């Protein structure tokens, strides 16, 4: 979480996916890590 609101939810999910989920999965005894948050990605919202 971000109590000071310095990081939006997207930044938290990005950081969690990029630097936490991998090292959590790399723990012995962890069978699966489901990330309830998606990695950052360049979105192109086109306008039809």
């Amino acid at each position: 979480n971000s109590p000071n609101n310095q990081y939006s939810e997207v930044d938290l999910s990005d950081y969690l996916v990029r630097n936490v989920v991998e090292e959590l999965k790399r723990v012995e005894g962890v069978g699966k890590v489901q990330s309830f948050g998606a990695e950052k990605a360049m979105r192109i919202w086109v306008d039809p």
Binding site: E22, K25, R26, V27, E28, G29, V30, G31
Partner: protein, 48 residues
Amino acid sequence: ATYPGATAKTINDSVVTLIERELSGVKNLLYYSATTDTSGTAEITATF
């Protein structure tokens, strides 16, 4: 794991980390290693 042409950085960040994320928590895993070389090839050795 083969991935022709691609230098070792690509095999290391796109392939080996993925497989290593599942190699943990395998039964009786003594230790595990993974070497990616310039031939576009990675050898991930799980030693039990």
